[PDB]
Amino acid sequence: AGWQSYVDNLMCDGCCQEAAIVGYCDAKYVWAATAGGVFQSITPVEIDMIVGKDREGFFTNGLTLGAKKCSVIRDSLYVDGDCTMDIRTKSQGGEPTYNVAVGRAGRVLVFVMGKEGVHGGGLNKKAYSMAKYLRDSGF
């Protein structure tokens, strides 16, 4: 409800089908997420793969979010002053792909997923801006 207001904020402009605030530093778990999305089901294992030391493996093997197979388009998670990743869901059964942006603050990750046709650029700006705001607030 407190962190849910942040999810609501991320969703308010109509471009995202889901969003989430996800702890990674003190412990790895979802703090808040859109009900019924993949982010809600993100596991500690999946968080570890997002934040982990290995920044090359997920370009060969992909990764999952809430067990949904994804590819990594760009990794700047440990580029200071950026701290984002651009991800895209894999298409199964003829379905659209969706762009996902991740912004990393000090304690949490900001996840957003676009609706069909929503470009990664605006999504990245949204995750970055929220992550930056949280970082400047000590989170």
């Binding site: 407190g2 962190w3 942040y6 609501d8 904020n9 402009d13 801006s129 607030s137 000590g138 989170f139």
Partner: peptide, 13 residues
């Protein structure tokens, strides 16, 4: 559950 947020999120666009 997690620590509460530091305050409200930024104003919506």
């Amino acid at each position: 559950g997690p620590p509460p947020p530091p305050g409200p999120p930024p104003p919506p666009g």
